[PDB]
């Protein structure tokens with residue numbers, strides 16, 4: 001998630017895994033998903 | 049692009065539909081919109 | 097099991113300023129920019 005010059009930019013990627021705990025190793029580049037012209041001052045965030 | 053619109057937006061009594069921001073703690077960022085209507089505190093002694 | 101459903105981004109999150117909601121409800125993906133009075137503990141059920 002990025003916030004630059006009035007644009008909120010989102011990149012993402014999905015991966016199949018088989019584990020129980022701990023963020024896994026490896027490499028995978030995220031691709032552009034969306035670019036929203038919201039024009040607000042984000043400083044904090046909260047997960048739903 | 050800018051053009052004069054006296055015929056459309058001027059009223060003989062006075063057209064008060066159009067508004068601007070005269071006070072902000074800090075300058076805006078590029079392509080940021082501020083619609084907040086919060087009583088601007090000039091000095092000390094908070095306003096409530 | 098699709099527990100994480102979205103996010104809210106903002107400054108004060110209390111309807112004096114504008115906030116961004118990105119939520120995935122059971123049927124749609126909803127993106128809104130409004131003046132929200134968010135709950136202190138938001139969640140889905």
Ligand SMILES: *[C@@H]1O[C@H](CO)[C@@H](O[C@@H]2O[C@H](CO)[C@@H](O)[C@H](O)[C@H]2NC(C)=O)[C@H](O)[C@H]1NC(C)=O
Pocket residue numbers: 041043073074075076077107
């Ligand atoms: C974006 O919002 C932040 C937080 O509301 C502003 O930063 C605050 O600015 C006030 C003074 O105006 C300070 O007292 C706070 O300590 C600041 N907090 C943080 C976390 O920085 C910031 O000025 C806003 N930016 C714009 C361009 O309005």
Ligand SMILES: *[C@@H]1O[C@H](CO)[C@@H](O[C@@H]2O[C@H](CO)[C@@H](O)[C@H](O)[C@H]2NC(C)=O)[C@H](O)[C@H]1NC(C)=O
Pocket residue numbers: 121122123124126
């Ligand atoms: C997920 O959110 C969408 C949009 O907020 C809901 O769709 C709306 O539902 C109301 C209530 O029936 C309708 O009046 C609107 O026309 C719908 N908007 C659409 C379809 O774009 C949807 O119902 C929500 N899903 C759940 C499970 O609550």
